[PDB]
Amino acid sequence: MQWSGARALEALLTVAGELRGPPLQLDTGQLLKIAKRGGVTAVEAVHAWRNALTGAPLNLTPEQVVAIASHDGGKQALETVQRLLPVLCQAHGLTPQQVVAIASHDGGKQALETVQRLLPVLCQAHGLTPEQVVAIASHDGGKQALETVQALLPVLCQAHGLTPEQVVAIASNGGGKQALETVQRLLPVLCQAHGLTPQQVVAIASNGGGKQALETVQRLLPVLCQAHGLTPQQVVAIASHAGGKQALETVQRLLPVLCQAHGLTPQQVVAIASNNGGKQALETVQRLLPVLCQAHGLTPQQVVAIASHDGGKQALETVQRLLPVLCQAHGLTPQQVVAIASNNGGKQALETVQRLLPVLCQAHGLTPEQVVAIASNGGGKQALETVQRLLPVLCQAHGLTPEQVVAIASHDGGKQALETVQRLLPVLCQAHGLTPQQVVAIASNGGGRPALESIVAQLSRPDPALAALTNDHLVALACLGGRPALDAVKKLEHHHH
DNA sequence: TGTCCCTTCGCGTCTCT
DNA sequence: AGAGACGCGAAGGGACA
Numbered sequence: 001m002q003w004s005g006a007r008a009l010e011a012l013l014t015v016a017g018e019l020r021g022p023p024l025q026l027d028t029g030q031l032l033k034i035a036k037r038g039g040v041t042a043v044e045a046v047h048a049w050r051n052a053l054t055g056a057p058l059n060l061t062p063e064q065v066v067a068i069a070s071h072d073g074g075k076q077a078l079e080t081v082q083r084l085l086p087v088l089c090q091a092h093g094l095t096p097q098q099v100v101a102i103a104s105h106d107g108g109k110q111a112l113e114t115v116q117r118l119l120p121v122l123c124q125a126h127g128l129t130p131e132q133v134v135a136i137a138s139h140d141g142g143k144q145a146l147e148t149v150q151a152l153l154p155v156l157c158q159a160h161g162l163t164p165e166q167v168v169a170i171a172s173n174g175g176g177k178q179a180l181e182t183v184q185r186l187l188p189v190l191c192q193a194h195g196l197t198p199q200q201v202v203a204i205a206s207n208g209g210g211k212q213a214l215e216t217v218q219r220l221l222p223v224l225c226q227a228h229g230l231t232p233q234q235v236v237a238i239a240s241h242a243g244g245k246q247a248l249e250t251v252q253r254l255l256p257v258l259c260q261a262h263g264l265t266p267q268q269v270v271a272i273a274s275n276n277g278g279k280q281a282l283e284t285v286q287r288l289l290p291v292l293c294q295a296h297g298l299t300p301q302q303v304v305a306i307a308s309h310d311g312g313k314q315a316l317e318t319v320q321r322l323l324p325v326l327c328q329a330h331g332l333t334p335q336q337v338v339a340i341a342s343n344n345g346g347k348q349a350l351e352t353v354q355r356l357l358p359v360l361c362q363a364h365g366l367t368p369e370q371v372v373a374i375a376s377n378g379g380g381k382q383a384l385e386t387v388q389r390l391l392p393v394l395c396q397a398h399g400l401t402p403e404q405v406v407a408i409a410s411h412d413g414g415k416q417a418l419e420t421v422q423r424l425l426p427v428l429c430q431a432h433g434l435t436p437q438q439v440v441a442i443a444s445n446g447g448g449r450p451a452l453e454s455i456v457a458q459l460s461r462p463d464p465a466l467a468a469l470t471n472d473h474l475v476a477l478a479c480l481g482g483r484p485a486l487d488a489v490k491k492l493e494h495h496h497h
Numbered sequence: 498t499g500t501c502c503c504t505t506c507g508c509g510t511c512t513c514t
Numbered sequence: 515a516g517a518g519a520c521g522c523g524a525a526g527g528g529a530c531a
Contacts, residue, residue: 002498037524041499070523073500104523107501138522141502175503209504243505274518277506308517311507345508379509413510446515447511484512 001040012040015047023054024062034066038074045075053078057086060100067104077108084112092119093130102137111142118146126153127164135172145176152180160187161198169206173242179210186214194221195232204239213244220248228255230266238273247278254282262289264300272307281312288316297323298334306341315346322350330357331368339376343412349380356384364391365402374409383414390418398425400436408443417448424452432459433471442478450483458486465493 001009016035019026024046034043046053046069053060058081060068068077085099092115102111115137122128126149136145149171156162160183170179183205190196194217204213217239224230230251238247251273258264264285272281285307292303306315319341326332340349353375360366364387374383387409394400398421408417421443428434442451455478457463459471469477469489477485 004498033524039499071500072502076500106503110501144502178503208506212504246505276508280506310509314507344510348508378511382509416510446513450511481514482512 012043015044019043019047019050024050024065026062026066030062030066034069034074037070037072039072042069042071042074042078045069045078049078049082052082058082059096064096064100067100068108071104071108072106073109077103077112080109080112084116088112088116092116094134098134102134102142105138105142106140107143111137111146114143114146118150122146122150126150128168132164132168136168136176139172139176140174141177145171145180148177148180152184156180156184160184162202166198166202170202170210173206173208173210175209175211179205179214182211182214186218190214190218194218196236200236204236204244207240207242207244209242209245213239213248216245216248220252224248224252228252228266230255230270234267234270238270238278241274241276241278243276243278247273247282250279250282254286258282258286262286262300264289264304268304272304272312275308275312276310277313281307281316284313284316288320292316292320298338302334302338306338306346309342309346310344311347315341315350318347318350322354326350326354330354332372336372336376340372340380343376343378343380345379345381349375349384352381352384356388360384360388364388366406370403370406374406374414377410377414378412379415383409383418386415386418390422394418394422398422398436400440404436404440408440408448411444411448412446413449417443417452420449420452424456427456427460428452432456434475438472438475442475445479445482447482447484451478451486454478454483454486463490465490 001012016031019031031043034046046065050065052058053065054062065078068074068081071077081099081103085096088094088099089096099112102108102115105111115133119130119133122133123130133146136142136149139145149167153164153167156167157164167180170176170183173179183201187198187201190201191198201214204210204217207213217235221232221235224235225232235248238244238251241247251269255266255269258269259266269282272278272285275281285303289300289303292298293300303316306312306319309315319337323334323337326337327334337350340346340353343349353371357368357371360371361368371384374380374387377383387405391402391405394405395402405418408414408421411417421439425436425439428439429436439452442448442455445451455474458465458474474486477489481488
């Protein structure tokens with residue numbers, strides 16, 4: 001391995017080799033993931049305790065073992081998991097999945113030991129639910145966040161007027177300790193001096209790097225309003241994503257250039273800045289605005305719309321690379337390429353439509369126009385790749401029309417909805433009398449999967465919202481408003497009677 | 498060279514309707 | 515239904531052993 005010893009690299013490769021064997025049966029991808037983030041000692045630990053982890057009272061799946069191992073200190077996490085999973089499950093109520101979720105971060109050992117130690121007091125003295133304590137714990141630095149919630153939740157509620165839910169939201173990111181301390185410290189000045197509300201301060205603090213965003217907001221809000229004419233509502237919006245600090249500094253540096261030299265409006269710059277990686281997007285639009293409107297290309301409106309998402313930089317650079325071949329070799333129009341690019345993971349959708357537009361048509365019989373519609377949503381790459389896999393079993397075994405599959409895939413989260421449909425189509429039709437017309441109709445929206453899950457929960461185990469919602473009313477509800485429609489309905493019978 | 502903590506970027510999904 | 519919100523993994527950097 002590294003430069004101390006030599007050619008017992010062989011011993012290490014042999015250890016990696018035997019992990020391809022049973023009980024874990026790991027593939028290249030999984031070994032690579034462990035080596036890249038847990039390091040050699042994590043790889044050696046997995047090998048050493050592969051039987052203990054997979055058996056006994058733990059019963060972990062290989063994917064679960066891989067998730068715990070693939071972080072700094074992973075060997076500590078695997079060791080500690082073996083020690084604490086049973087007691088956390090039995091004595092504290094948590095499920096194994098939750099224990100694994102806590103353990104699957106850098107310093108997982110510390111988080112698991114702290115949850116063991118603090119979950120009781122946090123539930124009893126502070127009123128949190130086990131679920132909330134798990135969400136706090138399930139990030140790098142989780143020990144610190146839990147200890148800081150314990151120390152500061154009282155003052156943040158009583159002196160600064162926040163709710164426990166709010167405190168939990170600030171705490172449930174990496175560097176949660178840092179954000180909670182910064183909130184305790186700057187909340188008064190941000191409200192009193194800069195005119196913000198607590199809600200806004202909370203929104204800025206409820207992301208990774210919140211500390212940095214809050215200090216940056218304290219520091220640049222004045223200049224950005226008084227010198228560049230932005231509103232405080234706009235500044236906050238920039239600041240309310242992870243990386244807000246970076247987006248704010250870049251806005252200050254590029255707002256004059258982009259409005260003067262390139263003709264964008266302030267509200268357009270803000271919209272580009274208000275996403276994760278806002279800094280990256282701003283710089284990329286400035287660099288690529290000319291060429292994207294050069295030799296024809298696109299309208300500036302369209303550049304802004306591509307830029308105005310998480311990963312916007314990746315989308316723009318992918319659009320610049322593939323627009324020509326996609327239009328020319330595959331026959332698409334720009335308006336379609338833009339529509340594919342203007343979602344989260346634009347880059348991923350484009351690349352996938354590149355390698356799958358030719359192949360979904362052939363091996364499965366879809367139109368291009370169908371294929372665009374799939375990729376023109378967030379998660380395009382996931383929808384396409386799942387259509388490729390699951391179209392055959394959906395039509396042939398479950399008897400669905402291909403146009404039906406396509407209608408399910410043609411929404412954000414399509415892969416979820418499909419994978420769910422396949423799971424829940426049988427129990428819905430044959431066991432509860434729903435038609436596949438109705439199940440397709442519930443699946444065919446955003447939040448298809450949760451809607452299907454909620455509906456089956458209510459049917460399989462008749463919940464308390466009594467029989468008046470017959471099976472067609474639940475379908476009409478599930479289509480109209482998903483899981484939220486379903487949950488709101490439950491929450492009302494609970495008190496209106 | 499491992500372990501812990503913090504910050505940023507990007508991808509994917511669901512809510513609000 | 516498009517914008518805005520949620521979650522989570524990868525990766526990189528700093529501190530300390």
